[PDB]
Amino acid sequence: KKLFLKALKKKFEGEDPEEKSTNFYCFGGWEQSERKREFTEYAKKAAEKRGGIPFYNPDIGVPLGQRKLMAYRVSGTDAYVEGDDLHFVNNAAIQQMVDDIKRTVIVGMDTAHAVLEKRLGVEVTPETINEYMEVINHALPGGAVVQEHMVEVHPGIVEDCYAKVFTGDDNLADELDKRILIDINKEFPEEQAEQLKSYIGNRTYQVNRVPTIVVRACDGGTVSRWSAMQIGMSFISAYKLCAGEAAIADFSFAAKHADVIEMGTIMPARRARGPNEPGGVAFGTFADIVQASRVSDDPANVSLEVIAGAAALYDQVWLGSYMSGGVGFTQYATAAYTDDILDDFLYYGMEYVEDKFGICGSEPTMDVVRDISTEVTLYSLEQYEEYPTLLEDHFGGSQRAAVAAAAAGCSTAFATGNSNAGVNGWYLSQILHKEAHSRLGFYGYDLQDQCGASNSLSIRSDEGLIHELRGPNYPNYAMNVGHQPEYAGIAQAPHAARGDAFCTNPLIKVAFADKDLSFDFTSPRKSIAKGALREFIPEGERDLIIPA
Template sequence: MVKDKERKDEAIPDYVKSLEKVFKESDKDRRTAFYRYGAWRQSKRKREFYDYARKLENELGIPRYNPELGIPLGQRKIAPYEISKEKVVVEGEDMHICNNAAIMQLFDDIARTAIMDLTPAHEILQKRLGKAVTPETLNRVMEVWNHTIGGAAAVQEHMFEINPLLVRDGYVKLFSGDDKVVDLLDKRIVLDINRLFPQEKADVLKKAIGDKIFALARIPTIAVRNYGSAMTKRWVATTCLSAFANVYGISGETAINTLVYTLRHRTIIGIGDTIAVRYGRGENSPGGIPFGYICDIVQTDRVYPDDPVKYLLDVAEISSILLDAGWLQQMLSGGLGAPIRVLFLISNEVFDSIVEHMADWVVEKYGGYGKAPWTISTIEEVAKAGSKYCQDIYDSSPLVCEMLFGGSLRSRVMAYSTAIAGGLASGHPMIGVEAAHLSQMIRKERTGRLGFFAQDQFHNQGHANDWTLLTDQAQVMEMRNASYPDYNVVANLTTFPSAIAGAYIARGGAYACNPLVKIAFSENLAGFDFGNIRKMLVKGALREFMPEGERDPVIPPH
């Protein structure tokens, strides 16, 4: 009897076990109860918020948060979420961008990052200004630059400076593909590629960047909080100029102007491109981050090189946070946090199980990753397999449908898992993207709808838009971003990074798009750990994550 029970338990998918745990109902039940759960009071966080709001009403004298208003809550169970693989249960509100300090830091750490090629500046110093650039002078520059990056003065006296405790997370480090150059530098200011990456990946990255010297700069979190992400490149360039002027004794308007132009415009690389003015966001904002860069920001493939599926899941998750929850729901729509866009890919083992199944299907169907031909037949095979597997789960599991409580979420899970499978199968992101588009058309034929209005428009147009390279409309897939025409709808933007990540894993190598971005996010002295994304999100949900940029050093004790 015990063995029979064990076999029966083993046959139950992990996602069903997880969902039964949080919903406290059996997946075999075909009926449920309504209006018996206590409305919004069943949520621990909503009860807390209600109590806070009553105190605020007394303090401020105006109405505050009141869940009794608007749409009635509690027709069905407001279930918590079990984070896949982490086995930690969290409240939905704790994954709202504004309630989760780790998610806020994730945005900040991308926004405050820039990379600078020091070669043009060194050429100006040597050829135009007659200065000797040596390892000793470069070490001195880095010492001064790590002083100025925190808003400190280096070339003028009687300047008002920033409390170092407010800007503790601002720093600059150097990296190069030439080990001989790196060996001559102060180890404190070196980002060591050989230490951070497996040897095979380190060799690929060093070959890609060559013997140039690059600076990774992260300005203080409080700077992007106060002034916006467009400040990053200016802050980096200005603080670098101060360091050069201090160490090399540069003065004179012509010399300074030449260096200013070079540092601000010729040598610096942001993480997010300039986007249309109408969006009201500067450089380094989520809407301008190339999809391929997102794949390189994620470091799971470096930390867990033997678990490629974990990397693929993390790319989908961070893309959903940046693009679906952050860009579309917060920055363009405004106000509503849509925390479900953060949660649904990492909860209750559902998406994990689907992606793991599709990865196994690719190996079984094609004999391994990257072996499928680049043909329409491959697109059709992947799309049919992905859409059928997902839809069969939706049709057979009421609890899965209760967790993915709208057509929008169900279509996203299908699109993202199919995009990953297409990239894995072929090694080409376009196969993954096209398979994802087709999967949505298949689902619409089967169910009659996808989700929100215009969600299918994105996929209908995608078959044509994805292939265009007109300069004002498109770019190769890795270099596109969320601000392209027809992408700013309630759409499945995570489709693109998912397909790119799958293709990268299939091809092998060390980076998906840009080796500089891959190296830049391999180390973060203070802030978000991009190699352990779920652990960071859980720490934020449990209120264990300590963010940077807080104003405690200059405000009353609290």
């Protein structure tokens, strides 16, 4: 059975999914939609607040809904929602996913501990780390620890702010307060735990999540600074230091520069942003943030969960607002995580790979890339050709090109274990798609796909880069929808096929293995669905400081 049929049958109730014809113009326009009706009603209720300024009006411009306006199944869920409920402005789960990433920074503790012992003659023990972690959980959300006559942040509005510690040293982990421990051996399957610890070694890290309200009022560049200020206050208080001496500057340099791990790197001037903003998150970094890898051993499922989160992050929020704005890019993104369509294509490719090569059963060669990418692209195209309702669902060429090529690229990575062979396969898929349907995506969709084969295995200046470390600022990729989310899946795919615990950074992977995050990173699909249903409670609202 094809995985998308269940959704088509519900989305096109009363109609044969294989029938080429239908009736239009018979739905009442916007009035067919619960959500459109709600929107129009709020627009009218807004008239008094706006004092005469015109507002949303369904009679301005395009009369939406001459065709049937679709509901969408969030893939891997049973949630069916109108597209508007998946717009990032309308979906608190998507916004909290981004805020939880922006507000996280990781700081090594071994250098600060060396400053204490070597420079300040102060001993560091499990008990003193535990006391420090208690102090920073008062200081990080805005509590005072040294000065008299301090004002403080209202704890009620920053209850999402906290700090935890993790270590590759099992002997130290057994001694740390479990209330503040991210326990690698408990969060990860045994083999993944062992892999993570071999790379992390006997090193200790704190994970600081600054308040959601702070990154909403300010930006991502605030996060490493806020973390570092309160790390400094917490060392001063917990270890009873002089509150302002030369050694303190060493904690600062360590926490803001020498021992810090941020989520995202800075942008060039044309698209200027500080750290911990979406354009700076490499694809492999995002795959490590998503936690599907540690709860599923289905490499297709793992890749698909990453693609869902990355579609929200890169296409809807980054490209659709930060870099553009407006109605934005909801359905460019939802095509990669709704109706189990991408699932059908990727499970086909994974099963083709399992049968012909074995998962991780081939070294990367052009023969293998060509074989797999071609076959999965043909299968994907044939699905749109056999199901008119499928093609009316993924109505925009860009959507189709991204989804077929995502299945082709991930499947190639499953066979070969090589992300750049994967992305080479993605570029083959795109030019084959174009030649089959005599179309591809929007006006500027294939800028990176026509340059892609040559730059996939390039070793030059701004061309060559291992795929896991490419991201939204890789030059070819810096402008266009329908690629970045899927590239995150391609970064995850060879590692999921191998059963790796992470793609690029074991510190990132452990730092999000934490039930106390607000967004559920083990399944971005399920969380986004909960947001679409208006059932997700975000952080950072201001109800406690504003009138009832």
